[PDB]
């Protein structure tokens, strides 16, 4: 088994990857928004939190 994880893309394609040092052990979370390569599927730019949308309507005044 060793060390591995599972990542599901937003394209409805679930990909499998072995232990990868591109992410920190504290950064591993279920339903964590991230991004990968268009083919090799390697995590590069990690998207922020707050899955799906934010408070669908907003008015901001300081």
């Amino acid at each position: 088994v060793g060390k591995a994880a599972v990542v599901k893309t937003s394209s409805r394609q679930t990909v499998f990857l072995p232990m990868v040092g591109l992410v920190d052990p504290d950064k591993l979370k279920p339903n964590d928004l991230v991004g990968v390569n268009k083919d090799s599927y390697l995590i590069l730019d990690t998207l922020p939190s707050e899955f799906d949308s934010r408070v669908k309507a907003m008015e901001v005044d300081e």
């Binding site: 893309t9 937003s10 394209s11 409805r12 928004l33 998207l47 922020p48 949308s53 934010r54 669908k56 309507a57 907003m58």
Partner: protein, 137 residues
Amino acid sequence: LKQTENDLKDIEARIKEKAGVKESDTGLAHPLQVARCTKIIKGEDAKYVINLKQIAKFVVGLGERVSPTDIEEGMRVGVDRSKYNIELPLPPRIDPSVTMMTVEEKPDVTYSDVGGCKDQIEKLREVVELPLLSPER
């Protein structure tokens, strides 16, 4: 046979219309439902690529700088879903999506009942016509 000879100068001008398309030739070939492009090849953070659809939902926290140099790829970037503002590169934003709108021109109607509407129409004129005359008051 007007349309027959109209395409003679139009097809020759279609290449001139294609000259504007020659900016981005990728992904084959302003009101929008949701902002959608193909891969947004053009695009702290420099390039900005965001798309909302059934595949590859994108989000970016930063912005307000020139990556694309105005329009890019699918030409549709701007207000949709709310929550989403691309402003800085000449946006096609806050534009009517697919919907049903009734818009006519010149609803011409003459006077009907002036009997009790003498000062009653004046109250209607103080609604629309009034700020269009002397807003300083």
